Amino acid sequence: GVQVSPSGEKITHTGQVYDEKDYRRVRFVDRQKEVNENFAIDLIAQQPVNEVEHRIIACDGGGGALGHPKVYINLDKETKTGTCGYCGLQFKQHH
Amino acid sequence: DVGAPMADVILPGAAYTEKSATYVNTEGRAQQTKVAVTPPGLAREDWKIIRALSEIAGITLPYDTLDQVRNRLEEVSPNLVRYDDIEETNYFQQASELAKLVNQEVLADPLVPPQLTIKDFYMTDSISRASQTMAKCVKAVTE
Amino acid sequence: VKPIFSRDLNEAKRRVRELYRAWYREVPNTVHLMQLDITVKQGRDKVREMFMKNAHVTDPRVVDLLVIKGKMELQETIKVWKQRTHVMRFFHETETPRPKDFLSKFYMGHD
Amino acid sequence: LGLREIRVHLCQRSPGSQGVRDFIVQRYVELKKAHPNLPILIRECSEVQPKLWARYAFGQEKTVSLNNLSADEVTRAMQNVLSG
Amino acid sequence: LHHAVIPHGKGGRSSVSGVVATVFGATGFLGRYVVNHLGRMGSQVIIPYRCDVYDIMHLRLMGDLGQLTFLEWDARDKDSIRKAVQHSNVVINLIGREWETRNFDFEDVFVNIPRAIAQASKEAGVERFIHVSHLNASMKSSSKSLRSKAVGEKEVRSVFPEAIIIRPSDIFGREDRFLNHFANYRWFLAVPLVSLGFKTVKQPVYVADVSKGIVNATKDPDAVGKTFAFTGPNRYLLFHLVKYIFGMTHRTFIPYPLPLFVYSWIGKLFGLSPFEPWTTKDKVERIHISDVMPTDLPGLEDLGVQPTPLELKSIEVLRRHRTYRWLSSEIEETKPAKTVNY
Amino acid sequence: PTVRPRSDVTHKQLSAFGEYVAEILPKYVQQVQVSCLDELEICIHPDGVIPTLTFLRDHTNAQFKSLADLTAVDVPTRQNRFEIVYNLLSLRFNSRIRVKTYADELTPIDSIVSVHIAANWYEREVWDMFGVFFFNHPDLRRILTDYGFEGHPFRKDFPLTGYVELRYDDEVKRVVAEPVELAQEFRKFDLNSPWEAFPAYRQPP
Amino acid sequence: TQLITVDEKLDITTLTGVPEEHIKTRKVRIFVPARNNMQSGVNNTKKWKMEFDTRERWENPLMGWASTADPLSNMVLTFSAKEDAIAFAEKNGWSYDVEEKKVPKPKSKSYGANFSWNKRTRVSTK
Amino acid sequence: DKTRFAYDGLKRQRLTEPMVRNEKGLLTYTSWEDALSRVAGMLQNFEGNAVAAIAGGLVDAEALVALKDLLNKVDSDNLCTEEIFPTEGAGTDLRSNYLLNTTIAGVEEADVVLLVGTNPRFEAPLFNARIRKSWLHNDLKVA
Ligand SMILES: NC(=O)C1=CN([C@@H]2O[C@H](COP(=O)(O)OP(=O)(O)OC[C@H]3O[C@@H](n4cnc5c(N)ncnc54)[C@H](OP(=O)(O)O)[C@@H]3O)[C@@H](O)[C@H]2O)C=CC1
């Protein structure tokens, strides 16, 4: 789901859009602007919250040493889901 | 925000991080801002702009370096080149003996600062009026 | 302070005159032999203005080290270790000079 | 044509500023109240050759090196730069 | 002005200057020097290239990373021109040939392609047009390319009223066709001149001085709306010009006169080749015409660049054609040619 | 297993050799430092560097025939900022020695060509990189810098990126020089941690 | 060797090979650096450091990297004495600007001062 | 907090190029060579005493020297500021009437501190920090 500019080119997940009165699109004629279609902002609400039966949890990102270091995040806040600061996947308390 | 939409021409100068400048505190001590980030766009230093204005006019200002501006600071008032130095003042008694002859009247109106509450400390003098950080500070305070 | 060759200024000035004599002797051989795109007159004026560039120093050890640096430039000019590219970057045929007035320095950059 | 401003410099403990210190300790307030529109500025610092800079109209100035005077003719010096 | 067009820098290649220049016709001779003088300043130069990529490989070195961008186009349609010029600050037209062919003629090359460049530039919204004409361009002229240059000047002013028509004179450089014509006349053992080179006065002007005039004319705000005429500091007679060229080449110099009709017949005989011709009838008539006496026109001196003469930088040109017997000889050994105001 | 083991017998016998050379050459030797790394750092006076290295080469009980290394280290705090080292190495005694003298950039050091012809190139390299005159050299011709490079580059007042930078042009068809402005600024990192690192190497106030 | 008796200020402009604009249009700051305020360590501030005036740093028009006009802006230098630093600045000939060393003052801080009867130094938290 | 979170204002609503009054009546982006020429052309016409400059705020003490010389060479004493200080009795002269004559280290060296003018916590807040440090670490009567 890539949004388009008013000029007609693509917009990255950093929010960068070249303006209409800018010369820096002159390397953009007859050569394609590389924009990744899989936005990391859009690919984090697709996976649901992970249920935690305790008051704290510790993720790894999957794979142990392949993923991230094992941060113990707090699950005492029930109104907001406790996000892992390394990944960004969200945890919800079960009770 | 104020002086630029009510203007005829606008000459952009540098900011306080953006020029090798002298400022005075309330103690009388003057210190030097070294230049941290050079000013963006075509904006230059303020004395550079006024000296270029003098050159494009018919007025021969005697500046070509920053050190000649510091020498003119020495020639006009020699407290603004002695950096990190409060100079020892005196002679308040003559000012009191002159101001005793001033025939002015107070009246019955309660004196008040304009920064009465906490909501208007965060927006003064066109930098905190322009930042989105202090707009979020005023937005968080006024809820 | 310890000297280098000269116990005064005028003996080092005589060494400067000797090096200028040898440079003026050497430079039409490095105009003709170098297949260079200049005459000999502005090359000799370039040698003279490079002598006048460091004219302000009255220090004998600094001008003795200028004498050995001019001798190394002479040693790389009599023999042809320098080429037609290295020998005339001094003329600044490509680099535009920085302007000296206040208005053009105001227009060019924050300086 | 007229005297636009006068800027008088001053040291702290040097003996060469003692006459203008005597002028600023007794004979200043009557000079200021004789003409309150004309500002007789005082800019002191430490270890300065003491001067008076009578800046006239159109940017010109007159610099009098007021060094090593007495309790007699300092006020005649700046009344001379007021009259002249 | 936008926030990226703002010039900052000392003046080298990695500085920014905001002269976003569409340099049409930059694959040839004056285009290489003006793309060098534009990329040395620190500008974004876009070259619409018509040729292969090999002859525009050598223009990649002229500036910093991404300061040079090459776009493939064709002169038949306006769509590639509008695809080139719509992100531009200035557009500099240097297009043209010294010979016509079966696909393109002189009227098409000097008129309709600058009219299409001017029309697509005006409909794209560029700030400054610079066109390059000839100095001898007039409507009543006896040269086909000069008559085409005059009616192309009229059509460029009809489309765009603020175009800077720069009219340089004969240009001499390291890969020119002005001095290289007289140095390729060395092979034919006797140089032919119209009336022995006496009735024709030529003004040689240096190519780096011309390209510095173009680069300064992109930035001078007084110079907008005007029409210029670049010329050298010393007017030269043609007989003394070919005498000075063969004197610093040090070959034999036996001139002989033959008139203009049989010169045009031998130019048509040498210009019928399918390859690049050594001489054309238009190339004969361009170098065998008296140039205009320079009055009432702005030139090179008001653009801040001093015009270097023929006697200082043509030893950079003439070193290719020199025999080893007189290879290492410098300029002042040879007698310089007499300047003629008449 | 983490710490390197220390053999102090080499420390005391090379310290006895350092006291030996410091006694036999009292005119030139200013001090002798012995590190914890079983090597000697004899700091001498630059007017007499050739008696020191002829004594270190030709004597039967020093016998440092083979010179190995010769540069400066430029410390601009000192009045004589260049600190010229001579790392020499005995083949027969299997030992090493360091000779450190000082230099200003105006006070020359008399060259050591007559004792070692190994330093026919090392002193030329020092004349490029730091810029001290070497007395009675056969040729002190510049070696590592460009032909016409104004500026000794290994001093601390020379920058990292230099001053000239070469560039081809088609105006003149030469590899001409320009004053360097960078495509990318070299990001200077504050790698000095603000906490005290070694209590043994503590500077007194 | 005989000693030569001269007395002038020192210039090594021609030895250092710098351009003339990099002396005459540049000024140099000799300063003990400030302590980094999120740190409480003093080991950064024992050395007298030398920095230059900061020149123009723009964005590269392809990417947006910091492109500097000045090669001298990357340099910092380390001394241990202010007069030796001013000797180095006087021999290199740049326009000096020296900030004096600012030390902490000895303040009488005691734990028993923080819990006092008549004084206002009693802290409400613990 | 104002000066440490007002750095984000330095990259927002910032003047970069010189702007001029257009023929329609708007403010358009032009160059220094046109804008300062318009300033000098309208500055050589009006002279004497009807040329005034209101400075004040984030403005250097070198900029005031250059402005003071450039407007005293067109012989006008019309150099006004933002905020009002009285010059009816002992205004600009005798530097004990607009300074902190006691040292800010000597704010510790006090006994009774009166504040008639303003609250210090929303107006020069580090002065409020020094008066709180003195008020805590010794007995001090603030009124
Ligand atoms: N004769 C002279 O000395 C003088 C000439 N002039 C004129 O000014 C200009 C100076 O340019 P100059 O470098 O000398 O000329 P060149 O012929 O050497 O270069 C111009 C370039 O234009 C390109 N070009 C021409 N016609 C077309 C076309 N129809 N389609 C695509 N590309 C085209 C060519 O590219 P490619 O062949 O690589 O595809 C050529 O490389 C020319 O117009 C010239 O006529 C001005 C003053 C003096």
Ligand SMILES: [Zn+2]
């Ligand atoms: Zn995780």
